[PDB]
């Protein structure tokens, strides 16, 4: 099967946001950064081309794009001849923007651009090394109740323990300014996502809205980077004060 | 549920090797390097642990391990408490060696070991940049016929254009590095040959062996190494290494698409 933009499946963002009981206007801004590790097509002469794509979808887009459908859409490029790399990037912008409902940004880079590019970790302190027992993996947001009692602080915390539903795996970076967060509670909360079902996008939005309503920080940023499924990974960034992360560099599991 | 070694499914190497007309005594030595990006389990206290696994399976093993079973087997660790990372590494070795049929080597690394680790590309000259037309995608090994007419040389070549499917599937993507000492290979022929794999259905390990045996039969190098690095599926990638003279690749460093 060749190029087929109708393979893309929009999912209205409002659908699962309704269950976060949001306000009229969004409490956050941000974007979903997708890495397309498998991007490949044929040039005009039938010679395969390979590239890595990077896509940025604004969090204000009416829809997100269902990842399997994104994967299938990309696969439809595989056996398709395009006259150039510019054409490929342009069609990607067109189709993805059409689907999302807002202009999407797309970078199509040759593999060579990645040579020597670092695997990175996240900012701040990892909260994952704690001596605690967890017997119960059921999602409990109330785990955050009275979570930030501390001194007013600006800090960045991260965790590699985000898991969801076969399993999805992710790391999450939480930067905030407010009463200092209890690290055990935060860890327990994050771990409680383990058995639970939502899109990565929806999960980041849940974590943001839960932290905001329980811990009431002055400013908050929640940024997760998930390992790829079907050659694509999703990296939702949601912030009270900030538009996007500085770069797309991959983490160890990605 | 809980840790379950029975999920592992071996696939005998003999299947494809018979297909490639090999005897019990192999033209090559080597191993299959797997990277396990998703390895996770619970510590004794129920706190999730995450690691990247690195598994080397000797090419002399009776069996390979079917990737999906391997993934499912690994998932069974997710909700299981293990006493230590040491116990995890031990269980992996024991179970994977039993499935493969020979002692497998396993390294379980913390995520932190990868910080600042650079992405690498393969060695030598990329053959991918050629202005040529591909008329059809059917696998053709005869594309290598008369492919090394050149003066005697030692060189390393690579291509990012390896693609494959399998009956069990969704395309697989890979890069392949070929180092040889022999009559110099025509790069157009080699590139075409590799591209002709696009619609091919076989496992990564089988592909690499096919490429090695094809190059050996058609190009008759004095020594040959074929090393492919494939993108992951289900959290696992396979990097088969096959050489006349060498037992293993120098490292597991990941490539752009991996
Ligand atoms: N992770 C499950 C999943 C399936 N399809 C998806 N599409 C998007 N955009 N995000 C997701 O998290 C998923
Ligand atoms: N990629 C196809 C595939 C499915 N299962 C597999 N198991 C192994 N060992 N190798 C493979 O290439 C595959």
Swiss-Prot record, chain A:
GO terms for biological process: queuosine biosynthetic process; tRNA modification. Catalyzes the NADPH-dependent reduction of 7-cyano-7-deazaguanine (preQ0) to 7-aminomethyl-7-deazaguanine (preQ1). Keywords: Cytoplasm, NADP, Oxidoreductase, Queuosine biosynthesis. Residues 237-254 have a biased composition (Polar residues). The keyword Cytoplasm applies. Homodimer. It is found in: Cytoplasm. One of its GO terms (molecular function) is preQ1 synthase activity. Belongs to the GTP cyclohydrolase I family. QueF type 2 subfamily. GO terms for cellular component: cytosol. Coiled coil: none annotated. This is NADPH-dependent 7-cyano-7-deazaguanine reductase. It comes from Vibrio cholerae serotype O1 (strain ATCC 39315 / El Tor Inaba N16961). Residues 235-254 are annotated as: Disordered. It holds the Pfam family QueF_N. The gene is queF. Pathway: tRNA modification; tRNA-queuosine biosynthesis. It is an enzyme of class 1 (oxidoreductase). NADPH binds at residues 67-68, 229-230. Substrate binds at residues 65-67, 200-201. It catalyses: 7-aminomethyl-7-carbaguanine + 2 NADP(+) = 7-cyano-7-deazaguanine + 2 NADPH + 3 H(+). The active site is at residue 168. Its EC number is 1.7.1.13.
């Amino acid at each position: 099967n060749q190029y087929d933009p109708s393979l893309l499946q929009p999912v209205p963002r409002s659908l699962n946001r309704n269950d976060l009981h949001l306000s009229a206007t969004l409490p956050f801004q941000g974007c979903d950064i997708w890495t397309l590790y498998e991007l490949s097509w044929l040039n005009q002469k039938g010679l395969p081309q390979v590239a890595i794509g990077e896509v940025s979808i604004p969090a204000t887009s009416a829809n997100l794009i269902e990842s399997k459908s994104f994967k299938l859409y990309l696969n439809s490029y595989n056996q398709t001849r395009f006259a150039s790399w510019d054409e490929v990037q342009t069609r990607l912008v067109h189709d993805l923007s059409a689907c999302a409902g807002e202009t999407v940004t797309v970078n199509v880079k040759s593999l060579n651009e990645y040579t020597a590019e670092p695997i990175v970790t996240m900012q701040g302190e990892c909260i994952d090394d704690q001596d605690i027992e967890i017997a119960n993996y059921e999602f409990d947001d109330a785990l955050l109740q009275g979570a930030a009692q501390g001194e007013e602080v600006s800090e960045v915390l991260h965790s590699h323990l985000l898991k969801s539903n076969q399993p999805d795996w992710g790391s999450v970076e939480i930067a905030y300014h407010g009463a200092k967060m209890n690290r055990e509670a935060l860890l327990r909360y994050l771990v409680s996502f383990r058995e639970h079902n939502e899109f990565h996008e929806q999960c980041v939005e849940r974590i943001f809205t839960d932290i905001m309503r329980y811990c009431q920080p002055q400013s908050l940023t929640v940024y997760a980077r998930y390992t790829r499924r079907g050659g694509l990974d999703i990296n939702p960034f949601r912030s009270s004060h900030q538009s996007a992360p500085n770069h797309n560099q991959r983490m160890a599991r990605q």
